[PDB]
C-alpha cells in the first residue's frame, strides 16, 4: 500500500546533522545537479514506523496510539537509553543515499521498537508497516526527488561523490523523541516534517 504517514526519530544530535549537510555539500560541488535530490536542512531522521490516516478521526487514532506507544519503548530500553552510532554510507541500489547505522546489540532493540509499533498501531485500526524487512538508515539524498535526473544525465549516486565519507563517524543519536508526520503536507518552518504528534524517549517523567 502507499502510506501517507509515518512514526520518525528525529536527528537531535547537531553534529551528526552538521556532517550530513557538509556531506551534501561535498556532493554539490562536484555535482550542482543533485542539487534537487539532497532532503533539505531540517528534515533528518530515522523513519520508524509508515502507515495510511486517511481522515481527522485516524489522525486522532494515530495520535493516541503513538501515546500508547511510549511507554512499551521504555519496557524494551530495559530503563536505559538507546544510541545510534551513525558511521559511513551505504545505498539502496543507488538511488538512495544514506547514512548508516552502525553494527550492534542496538540494532535489535530498535527493530523491537518498530515491530511493536506495528503492532500497537494495527490494533488501534492503523494500516501500518511493510512487508519488506526493516532495513533503519538515515537519508541524506534520493534519486525519486528529482524526477529530471532519470530523465536527463543521471541515473545512480556515482560513489565516487561520497568516497571520502565512506567510512566516516557521523557521530551517536540518543533516542530522545518519536514523532507522528505526515507525508505530504507542508513542513515546518525549520524544515522538518509536518507533526501531529510527538512523544519523550528517555526522559524523568
Ligand atoms: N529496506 C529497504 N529497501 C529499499 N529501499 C528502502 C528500504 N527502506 C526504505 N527504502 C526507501 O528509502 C527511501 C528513503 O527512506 P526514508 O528517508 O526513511 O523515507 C524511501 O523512499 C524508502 O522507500
Given at each position: ?72 519503548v521504555e519496557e ?23 547514512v548508516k547505522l ?60 561520497y568516497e571520502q ?41
Open positions: 500500500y502507499q502510506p501517507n504517514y509515518f512514526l520518525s526519530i528525529p536527528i537531535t544530535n547537531k553534529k551528526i546533522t552538521a556532517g550530513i549537510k557538509v556531506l551534501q555539500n561535498s556532493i554539490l560541488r562536484q555535482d550542482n545537479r543533485l542539487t534537487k535530490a539532497m532532503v533539505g536542512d531540517g528534515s533528518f531522521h530515522i523513519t520508524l514506523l509508515v502507515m495510511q490516516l486517511l481522515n481527522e478521526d485516524e489522525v486522532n487514532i494515530g495520535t493516541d496510539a503513538l501515546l500508547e506507544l511510549k511507554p512499551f524494551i530500553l530495559e530503563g536505559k537509553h538507546l544510541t545510534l552510532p551513525f558511521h559511513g554510507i551505504g545505498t539502496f541500489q543507488g538511488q538512495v543515499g544514506f552502525a553494527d550492534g546489540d542496538h540494532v535489535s532493540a530498535l527493530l523491537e521498537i518498530a515491530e511493536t509499533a506495528k503492532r500497537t498501531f494495527q490494533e488501534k485500526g492503523i494500516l501500518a508497516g511493510e512487508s519488506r524487512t526493516f532495513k533503519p538508515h538515515l537519508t541524506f539524498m534520493k534519486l525519486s526527488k528529482a524526477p529530471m535526473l532519470w530523465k536527463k544525465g543521471v541515473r545512480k549516486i556515482e560513489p565516487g561523490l565519507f565512506i567510512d566516516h563517524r557521523f557521530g551517536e543519536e540518543i533516542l530522545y523523541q518519536i514523532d507522528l508526520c505526515s507525508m505530504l503536507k507542508k513542513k515546518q518552518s525549520n524544515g522538518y516534517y509536518h507533526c501531529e504528534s510527538s512523544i519523550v524517549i528517555g526522559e524523568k517523567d
